[PDB]
Amino acid sequence: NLARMNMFLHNINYDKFDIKLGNTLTEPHFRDEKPFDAIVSNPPYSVKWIGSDDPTLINDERFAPAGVLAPKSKADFAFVLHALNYLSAKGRAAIVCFPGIFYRGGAEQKIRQYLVDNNYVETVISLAPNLFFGTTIAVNILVLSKHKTDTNVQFI
């Protein structure tokens, strides 16, 4: 509710500026509209969800080439595998993450393997502690693209 009135206060029009209610993982829409030219995100931590798998989420369209799923308490990278389905050729993604990845278990090891196995990740930028509300650690900023240079430049 407060999100749907947040942009309404800032002189924005009526037509398109929607927010849909539900899980972005299990209930996406619009699939059919469209590969986007820019996304932004901030996923919450501890957003656990049923796998891996009891549901049909093994065979979904956003997980076609990548690798094995994301477990429950480490559900951050499910948003970023959700990300690069909903992106065009042109634009870029800018997502945020926990810093503490070494390989994050035998599931996320091959997730990071897949993400750097192409030029999907363009840059990663670490941040400054605290600069938030009681974290006290910093966070990551991954900037992804389907867009070559190609070297995985790490401007942390």
Binding site: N13, D15, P35, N59, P65, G67, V68, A89, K148, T149
Partner: protein
């Protein structure tokens, strides 16, 4: 939005935005310098001038290399065991197949006029983009053409006009220079992408383009490049997903570690399964992949192009020596096996070393007899197995009939390719199934549905009656040349098959076929008896069993009657085929070769040629046999193959009633549209009257409406007053509503072609008979029916449409709320500015103003260009334009110029804010319509905001000006 130079410029800008680095090289040797700069970055070597010229001329540019040699350098001969100055033996790559993203890519345009764009892959060109104009059709552009040596490395062409876009593999064969091997591109859901910009926004991902060129390019053992269909490419990486994803989750050897691909027939299962197998061999933990195909699923083609790949074992033999050779030896990680070798393995052995290894399967169109046997030992033996199945007719849980299903084996679905996609994309042909109730003597028996008298009345009063069969056969032998275009000399012709059920029945068939062959010379002497030939051994309506080729199934009624068929075959052919499961198998394969080039022109098979046989050389099937779902689909998939423009639909003449079975078996697959996309209604219903009792309304009965609209309103000049308007509109809406459904029928267009006859015109007799499946009875009864001429068809819809604009702004009577407008009914056969500008050059030797004035008032959606076209041709001279597309581009250039003028003119005359006006106009242009929503309409009104009275003027007044402006320039560019 049409100038192809600017289309090329937008292509350049989009590819620069996606990451293609655009360079500019206008010399021959700097191309090689770029290649040297790319390959030294890729492989990490350093050439001097001597090593670079040596590597160029000795490995890259031996000048006598053919185009097949250029392609051979790509997929096999791409690693040179190369010698340096210090004479060390290193590997030299061209394209890194391990990590595809390593290869840097660039784009150029050629030298030297025409507008083409070439994609350099590590400096090497593989992809040429031709951009032909919008006046040029793409099939016409392909028939035009299809130095130096670097531009002979090309592997793929994409030709487009902006509206349509197709791609095809680089071929130099002249039969392969026919247009039918060019393909469109679709998304994952098999919805087409026809336009240019979305084709670039989908196909021109770097990963996608390199993946197609590397891991999906069919380079066979005959140097013939093929490119897989997009649903095949989508479904292959579903499999290569599912293997790794089930392996890491460690859920192997279970039905959820199964998974089925559902591709209809016409999916390249010789090719697709083989390519997925070869990609599955490259996985590290996977060691053994089983290519499980029936010998019914095999042909000569799996023995033809697989000579270096798998020779002299790809057939249903009994020996597991070719099995155990791959069960022991490495580097052949694919095991091409058959159900006979598999049954020998599952009955002779349960002690293989391969059980604790990785086991991968491929299945193909499986029935319930052999595949119902094999899984019972497959669950017994294997420890880590991966089973995947290709099918076109699934063994559903919906029609399971007591036994093992697709969900029981494979479970979850991986990828679908329905039949109506191939119907929708012309990979198959439509059908002709109306029931042949030519004999009511066996009326309830030729329409019998209960199981009882279909088999237990194996007698000459239900189904073995010879005098029934040969009068049926005389009906075939009258329509033998007729239904296969052969009564018109000039066509090549086609042949037919026969669906039979048993063996002694088939003896009574075939010997009496020979009796009518004798009576085709005795009683007729003009019907030339073509060599009827049967094939069947012994089996072994809901289960298609493969008739095995051993003498442990046949008798003298089966085998020795087939030997009579041998000695009547060798009475004409004199062949060298024996009677085992090899020589009779090769007899079957030579027979399939002779039917393939239409030597034998009548075939009689009990239960074969169904799951694996493919031939576009047959258009008609005669069926006297009951069938159910999978047999229905496979038998109907025998005439559906596209061949040329002539073969358009496949005839099925059913003698047992299976039309409701056809309805319910295609209702298994598609939509309520699809029951009448193809078939299933008789033509006389809508023409001469019927009644749907769902609401009990007037289901006319088209000629009644025809004669009423003829007599009551002969012309739009007869339509003056308002009730005279409504009495025409209320019936002409029902006219077009019937005509829309009639246009799906063949007989309606047959009648439209009979509206263009001449007297007596033996061309329009002879050419029209056996190229539209027409006799003289059609010449009588379709001349009894008449249609108004096409000038009347133009002025009927113009009289509809000017009344439709007369209902606009009125809003100012007879009631018009009961009169429903018909927007999708005038969607039939628009004039889309192409038919106008074709006639603009075709009108020679102006006085064509009345022609364009008539045609512009026919179509809604074009009439505000009425003030654009005529004012064009009064202003400009068509003598300066050389051809059609030049006058098209001149017209749209004039249109954009006057659009940009009158856009300023309409804003100057009404005192808007210029920036808000310029935003809203070109927002509505690319938006394709106009709206009321959004604050920017009040911000472009712009000065007052009510505070009524009254503010319809100027608000809805300027709005009505703007919507007419949008109708004036919809479908054109300009800013």
């Amino acid at each position: 939005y049409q100038s192809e130079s600017d289309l090329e410029r937008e292509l350049i800008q989009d590819l620069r935005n996606q990451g293609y680095e655009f360079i500019s090289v206008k010399s021959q040797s700097a191309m090689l310098a770029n290649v040297r700069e790319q390959l030294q970055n890729l492989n990490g070597v350093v050439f001097n001038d001597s090593e670079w010229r040596r590597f160029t001329e000795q490995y890259l540019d031996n000048p006598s290399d053919g185009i097949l040699d250029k392609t051979r350098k790509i997929h096999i001969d791409y690693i040179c065991d190369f010698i340096f100055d210090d004479e060390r033996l290193e590997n030299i790559y061209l394209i890194d197949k391990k990590n595809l993203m390593r290869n840097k890519v660039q784009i150029i345009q050629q030298f030297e006029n025409r507008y083409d764009v070439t994609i350099l892959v590590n400096g090497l060109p593989l992809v040429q983009i031709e951009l032909k104009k919008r006046g040029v059709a793409i099939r016409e552009a392909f028939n035009q053409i299809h130095e130096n040596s670097l531009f002979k490395y090309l592997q793929l062409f994409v030709i487009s006009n902006g509206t349509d876009t197709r791609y095809f593999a680089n071929t130099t064969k002249r039969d392969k220079n026919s247009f039918d091997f060019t393909m469109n591109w679709a998304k994952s859901d098999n919805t087409l992408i026809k336009d240019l910009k979305d084709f670039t926004a989908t196909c021109f991902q770097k990963h996608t383009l390199l993946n197609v060129l590397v891991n999906y390019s069919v380079f066979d053992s005959s140097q013939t490049l093929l490119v897989m269909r997009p649903y095949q490419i989508a479904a292959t990486e579903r499999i290569l997903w599912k293997i790794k994803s089930s392996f890491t989750a460690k859920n192997w050897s279970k039905p959820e570690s199964g998974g089925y691909i559902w591709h209809t027939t016409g999916s390249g299962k010789t090719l697709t399964s083989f390519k997925a197998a070869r990609l599955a061999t490259e996985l590290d933990f996977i060691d053994k992949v089983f290519f499980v195909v029936d010998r019914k699923d095999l042909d000569y083609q799996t023995m033809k192009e697989y000579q270096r790949f798998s020779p002299d074992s790809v057939n249903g033999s009994e020996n597991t020596a070719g099995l155990k050779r791959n069960l022991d030896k490495d580097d052949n990680k694919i095991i091409v096996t058959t159900i006979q070798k598999l049954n020998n393995l599952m009955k002779a052995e349960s002690d293989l070393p391969v059980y604790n290894q990785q086991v991968v399967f491929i299945f193909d169109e499986c029935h319930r007899s052999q595949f119902g046997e094999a899984q019972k030992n497959l669950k017994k033996k294997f420890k880590r197995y991966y089973q995947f199945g290709f099918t076109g007719t699934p063994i559903f849980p919906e029609n399971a009939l007591g036994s093992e299903t697709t969900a029981s084996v494979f479970g979850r679905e991986l990828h679908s390719y329905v039949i109506t996609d191939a119907i929708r994309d012309e990979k198959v042909l439509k059908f002709k199934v109306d029931y042949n109730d030519v004999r009511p003597q066996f009326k309830s028996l030729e329409t019998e549905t209960d199981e009882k008298k279909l088999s237990a009345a194996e007698n000459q009063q239900a189904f073995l009656h010879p005098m029934r069969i040969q009068e049926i056969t005389q009906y075939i032998l009258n329509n033998f040349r007729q239904k296969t275009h052969r009564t018109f000399p000039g066509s090549k012709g086609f042949n037919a098959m026969l669906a039979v059920s048993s063996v002694d029945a088939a003896k009574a068939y075939y010997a009496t076929f020979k009796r009518l062959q004798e009576e085709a010379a005795n009683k007729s002497a003009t019907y030339k008896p073509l060599r009827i030939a049967t094939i069947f051994s012994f089996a072994a309506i809901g289960e298609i069993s493969d008739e095995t080729f051993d003498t442990s199934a046949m008798d003298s009624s089966a085998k020795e009657f087939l030997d009579a068929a041998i000695r009547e075959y060798n009475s004409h052919f004199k062949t060298n085929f024996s009677t085992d499961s090899n020589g009779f198998q090769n007899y079957y394969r030579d027979l399939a070769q002779r039917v393939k080039n239409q030597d034998i022109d009548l075939l009689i098979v009990v239960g074969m040629f169904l799951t694996g046989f493919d031939a576009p050389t047959l258009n008609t099937l005669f069926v006297d046999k009951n069938l159910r779902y999978h047999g229905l689909m496979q038998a109907f998939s025998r005439t559906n193959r596209i061949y040329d423009a002539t073969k358009t639909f496949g005839n099925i003449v059913t003698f047992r009633d299976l039309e409701r079975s056809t309805i319910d078996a295609i209702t298994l697959f598609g939509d309520k549209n699809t029951k009448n996309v193809v078939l299933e209604k008789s033509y006389t219903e809508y023409m001469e009257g019927f009644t749907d009792a769902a609401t009990g309304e007037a289901k006319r009965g088209f000629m009644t409406v025809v004669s009423e609209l003829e007599q009551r309103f002969p012309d739009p000049t007869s339509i003056e007053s308002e009730k005279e308007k409504k009495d025409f509109v209320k019936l002409f809406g029902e006219y077009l509503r019937a005509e829309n459904i009639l246009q799906n029928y063949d007989e309606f267009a047959t009648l439209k072609a009979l509206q263009q006859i001449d007297l007596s015109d033996p061309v329009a007799v002879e050419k029209f008979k056996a190229e539209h499946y027409v006799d003289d009875e059609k010449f009588a009864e379709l001349q009894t029916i008449r249609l108004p001429a096409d000038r009347k068809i133009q002025d009927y819809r113009s009289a509809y449409n000017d009344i439709r604009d007369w209902q606009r702004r009125e809003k100012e009577t007879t009631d018009w709320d009961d009169v429903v407008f018909e927007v999708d009914l005038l969607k039939s056969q628009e004039i889309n500015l192409d038919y106008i500008l074709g006639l603009i050059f075709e009108h020679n030797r102006g006085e064509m103003i009345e022609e364009v004035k008539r045609l512009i008032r026919s179509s809604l959606g074009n009439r505000a260009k009425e003030g654009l076209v005529v004012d064009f041709i009064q202003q400009t001279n068509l003598d300066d334009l050389p051809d059609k597309a030049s006058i098209i581009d001149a017209f749209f250039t004039f249109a954009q110029r006057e659009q940009q003028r009158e856009a300023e003119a309409l804003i100057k005359e009404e005192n808007l804010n210029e920036d808000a006006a310029k935003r809203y106009i070109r927002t509505s242009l690319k938006r394709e319509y106009a709206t009321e929503n959004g604050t920017e309409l009040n911000e472009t009104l712009p000065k007052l905001s009510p505070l009524n009275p009254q503010y319809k003027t100027k608000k809805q007044a300027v709005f009505q000006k703007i919507v007419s402006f949008i109708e004036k320039f919809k479908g054109v560019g300009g800013k």
